[PDB]
Design a protein around this nucleic acid. Sequence first.
DNA 1: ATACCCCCCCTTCGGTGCTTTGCACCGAAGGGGGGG
Lengths: 411, 526
Amino acid sequence: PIETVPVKLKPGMDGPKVKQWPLTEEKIKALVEICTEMEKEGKISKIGPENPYNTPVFAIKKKDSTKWRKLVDFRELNKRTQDFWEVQLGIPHPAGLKKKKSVTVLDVGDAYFSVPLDEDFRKYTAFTIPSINNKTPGIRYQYNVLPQGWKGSPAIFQSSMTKILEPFKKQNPDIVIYQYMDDLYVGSDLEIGQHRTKIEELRQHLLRWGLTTPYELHPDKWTVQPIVLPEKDSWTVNDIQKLVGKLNWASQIYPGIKVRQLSKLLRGTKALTEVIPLTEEAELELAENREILKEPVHGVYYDPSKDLIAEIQKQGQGQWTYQIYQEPFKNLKTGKYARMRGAHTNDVKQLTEAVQKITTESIVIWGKTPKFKLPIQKETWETWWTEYWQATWIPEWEFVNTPPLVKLWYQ
Amino acid sequence: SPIETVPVKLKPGMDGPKVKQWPLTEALVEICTEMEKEGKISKIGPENPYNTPVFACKKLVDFRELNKRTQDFWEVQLGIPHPAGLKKKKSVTVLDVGDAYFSVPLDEDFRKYTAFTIPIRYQYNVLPQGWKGSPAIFQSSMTKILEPFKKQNPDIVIYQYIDDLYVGSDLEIGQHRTKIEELRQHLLRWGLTTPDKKHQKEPPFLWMGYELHPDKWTVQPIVLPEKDSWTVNDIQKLVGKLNWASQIYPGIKVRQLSKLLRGTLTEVIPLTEEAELELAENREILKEPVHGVYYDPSKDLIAEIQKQGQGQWTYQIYQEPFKNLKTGKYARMRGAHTNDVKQLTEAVQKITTESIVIWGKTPKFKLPIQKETWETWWTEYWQATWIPEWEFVNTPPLVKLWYQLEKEPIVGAETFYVDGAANRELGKAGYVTNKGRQKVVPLTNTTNQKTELQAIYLALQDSGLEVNIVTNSQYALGIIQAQPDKSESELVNQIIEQLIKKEKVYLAWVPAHKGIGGNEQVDKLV
DNA sequence: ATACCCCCCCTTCGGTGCTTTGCACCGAAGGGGGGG
Ligand SMILES: Cn1c(Cn2ccc(C(F)(F)F)c(Oc3cc(Cl)cc(C#N)c3)c2=O)n[nH]c1=O
């Protein structure tokens, strides 16, 4: 039949022992009828008390999906097995994928369930279903086959994936291919009627050889938003003081940003609300400052060795930002995620969709998910984020309790 | 009898226990000989180096090192059931199994790891006591016995905690008796010696602290300990008992009782008049016992929240008006500086997560706060916060925003500047306003942030109703901008009171020790 | 009797990370209730 690749951990550290958080009654009701079916088809099997490893589980509803799905939080397993994918097999990141006109994302994880998994590793991927009012203990199940959402599963399956997609790569060398987790990114420089034609052609092609998969985003049409200083004719002491302070803050990002004449301009303890003249020397200083700000930060470079860190600041009125970088004060990218559509309905949902957009863009551009620094309290985030989640990947996040009151990316 | 065992092992590195046994003791020989007949504890040869400690009471066999050396076991249980989450059931029965542990076999390979030498050596064919995974092993086996019955018919609702088997149904009495007898036989088929059907309980029950009636429930009656002199330990016991009682009795305050504990088991301390008065009030509340009710899925949960003052809230989850399902209080204070809205959202988060844990769904809240207030707060706070769903309820005290720090400068208000310093290797405060108004003053046990807060307090002290301020530190901005009410620092409380007294205040920030604007003078004197 | 585990509740430490030297913060412990 189909063989399996043994999986080994890194000796010296333990496996996943994450306590499984509670779930709504409907989530349990759907997960029962999903995991019973998965057990009937030999995909999963039960286990007894002797298994000391557990991972969470929750039933999301996919985008425009009449049914439910399932996700298992495999963050700790990846945290313990990063070296498996970092050494065994690594797919090169296409530099041209960032510059393609459009790409399409398909959920190709179904074939991940048709490949048997190792015997020794099979123990580690055990997940617990909760119970209503904890009347009965968790029915702890075990993945018999390769699991959807596990980082090391694509490493195993990429050989057969390549074998499948080699005809498509041959007949269509223009298309660029990138697989991340259970998702596949296909990149083309075609029109809507032709991009859709080729994506449906690829779907039919996968159907012809026993692989079934049940939106469009433009990598090239993403533009960084450069910071700018406010400009007007009548300036006050308060406004010029704010401008000098912002020039200070921004001197950290830009080495060449200086403020000395404006600092020397303000010497007396004057009222904030009075109108103050602005000399032509300050005009030239402001022009040079804006010229520096318009240009992207000189010397910006990327290192795959480090991890990607993304901060988010909420500017109100249904507007958020996101800054992705590795080394402090030299941002690799900045953005502006704005929507007033869901403002009247939700607030955390905005943060969830922002996080999804950031991680999708980072996967398209640099290829690895960012580590998020969310502006939200830990428990209120952990209570509700799953209710507004639709992506089969799970990014890593940590809540910085420090108040970032600067917020000079947008006054 | 036909119960397949479960593999047992240990943490890698070294074998089982090796401490010398003790045959002679307070007789204790014929007790274990009887189980050799039916094989619960069998005889083994003198080739067992895995010696174990021996104990017998009137057999809590000691495994003080075996539990330290046994492989880690995952927690089978994840809490304790609550009566409010039980649906209305007509017929109910309890079938607590006999000792739950001498009818479940132990793994064949593992028997060699434990021994009982009473001259000779006996091996355990059965689960011992003081064992790491014994509740988990029995619970899994006990589910493996149950599930064919539940699959046969799901009408019968079965709860199970530790060794206990709570059966409920909406059928007639005789049909329920027939079904429970069938369950008894089904359990017996796998070799469980349950107590006789005459010994099963009939309502009202007594559970883990909760007495259950055909249509109501409550906790077992409790009394409040009384003594002229209180040590700390009895105060902690009283606090714990009050917290336990706070699940069904509305409006229980245990905070300003708990502040007495801040001064510290056997050590004895005096009391406070507040403590005695509120203990009497709590005794008056607990004098008359109240009743809860049972869940009804054909309806919806509607919780309400009230504020009792100084960071304490009470909630009362129910379904039918003035018929509580559950009650509770939230009082914990994490961090330093919070207003009432932050604590209110913490309270609603805790209530909804508890409701998910218990009844598996969230309640449609009722909050005592205006819609526009929460709208402004969530559109103005820099963090992201949410509230599930809530309707306005008019009940004082009414939580609201105390003071609004202006986001724009105002005319007709003096512009103050503030600064201070200290010694890095005992600080001072000193500043110059737009007209030279200086109030330099030293202070002890202070640093840059303390003297900045002191300068802010001074500027508020020597200003009018409307005033604008320019600061050289972001720490004060972070403190005051959150609109705080209560704080550890009394200076912060005074500043908050000053801002409440005033009408409109606007702030700004400048870089420190840079000589920019008014920073030259304020960083010159101090 | 003196050892053994689960949710809840508090108070009091330590360590983190600068917000870098106090401070705000959070997690782990030490008692309390319920007991098993
Ligand atoms: C008294 N009573 C009731 C209440 N009630 C309703 C359902 C069940 C169920 F079938 F779920 F077990 C009950 O069994 C339990 C559950 C628990 Cl946590 C503890 C105890 C004890 N001691 C008994 C039950 O007590 N309904 N009708 C009536 O007379």
